[PDB]
Amino acid sequence: MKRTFQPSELKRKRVHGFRARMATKAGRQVLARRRAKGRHSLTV
């Protein structure tokens, strides 16, 4: 049966990517929180 995750790299980058995060203030807050926590990878 079809499962929920159907991968597509273009859609992944356009929804959760670096420029998508930078495009809004809430995404920039997400990036700030992840930098403060010290994540090794900021985005997908």
Add this chain to the structure above:
Amino acid sequence: MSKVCQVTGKRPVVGNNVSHANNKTKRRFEPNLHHHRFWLESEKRFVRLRLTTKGMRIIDKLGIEKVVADLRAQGQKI
């Protein structure tokens, strides 16, 4: 880019509705804002201002030229 009087700086303020049972809910009071064209003789043109009726009274009392000069001094494009 807002509900701000150009002459007085008036803007909406918050308050309460108070019912007969004393329930309180937030509201705003808005200024009596509108657009108005004023003849400027020194510049031979109409200037369109967003202002309140109190600002209109101030213009009545002080003359349009003085008010326009004051706004330009505060840094407005009139």
Add this chain to the structure above:
Amino acid sequence: MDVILLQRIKNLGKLGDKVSVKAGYGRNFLIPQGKAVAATEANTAAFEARRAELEKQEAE
């Protein structure tokens, strides 16, 4: 407003009389078109001290 007329008006007066009108009348018709000037002390002094002779001079 209190205004000083710069010309003849049918029911108001003529040629320098000070008369109280409704604010809209002064603001939107008389003052912008030059038929009157707001009766400030400076305006009254400037009108009466000098210019009044030519204002009277213009008959029509």
Add this chain to the structure above:
RNA sequence: UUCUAACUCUGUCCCGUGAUCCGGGACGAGGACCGUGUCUGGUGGGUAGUUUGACUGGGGCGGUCUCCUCCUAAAGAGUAA
């Protein structure tokens, strides 16, 4: 009843301008109306916060909830359903 000058136009023309936005100008049709601010009466499950008792031979339905008199009450007082 009439008017224009505040104000309206998701009507025409001109310019910014390579532009069905916007701004300025000229017209036309309206016009002290419409519309907006403050105050105010009405309507208002559209939406929101809540309330909707207890006893009880389970609960509900019925009955009862305070006071006075007699019996139960066992010859002082008090004594439950």
Add this chain to the structure above:
RNA sequence: UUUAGUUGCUGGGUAUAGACCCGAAACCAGGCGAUCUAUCCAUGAGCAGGUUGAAGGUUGGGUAACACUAACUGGAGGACCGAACCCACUGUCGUUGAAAAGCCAGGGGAUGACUUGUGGAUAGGGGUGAAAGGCUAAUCAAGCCUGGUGAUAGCUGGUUCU
């Protein structure tokens, strides 16, 4: 008219604080989700084979002329049978499964209100719904995450040497 208080230190009790510890269903604020699914938008793709014979057209009989009538053409349909494809009506099996929804044997639609790829739009008292309170990432009579927050619990449990 009662005629020993007061300031420290230690201990018992009370009050305000989470106040002995663990436990809700909830309520509020800000963010994250339409790679599943619902509807829509743009641009592409798919439907073996076989039937039936609508409208229309031509010719021929027949009338005073119409009427009427036969044959041949023509190829319509939310048309018919039936693979791919899309569904899910019945039964056995499976139920610590091969599988967190299946297999097998039958079953329905199959040129249409059809199926489908890629890329987009709609975001939580909101969306979408040929309408079942259905669906909104194995979660839905109000999604998920983080905060208020150690919510409150007249309730249940537990509470350690002589």
Add this chain to the structure above:
RNA sequence: CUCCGGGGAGGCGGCAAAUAUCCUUUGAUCCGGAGAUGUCUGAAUGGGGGAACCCACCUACUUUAAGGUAGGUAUUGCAACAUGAAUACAUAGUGUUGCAAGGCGAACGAGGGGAAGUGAAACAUCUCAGUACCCUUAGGAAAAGAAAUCAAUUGAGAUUCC
């Protein structure tokens, strides 16, 4: 990598031993100060974009082939200069040059908005509480501050904190 100063026999960073080539009393390794270099992404600023990629233009020098070197090319605000509609004067608009700003980051400050769980043994006034949270913006602190203030024998004498 360079210079200045220190130091005086070892050294070629660690996991991580061995190995080779080696360096060093003509002063190494090492320590301190000052310089040189400093790819690409990122406010990212020549345009674009799915971050670390794609595509450019203009000057000056250089090369003969299909290139190299250096510089410039974002937006907004202010100033100067130039240019310049409807429309005559103007104004709007346009361009060049110069200067400035944007982004990040603990807590504390100032300002703009602002809950509910909870308590009241129910609950609506009230409480929680101007708390949590969202937004804007400084400084080493910020804010406030020199009485149209208090007091009530006519006295005190600006703010801030205990």
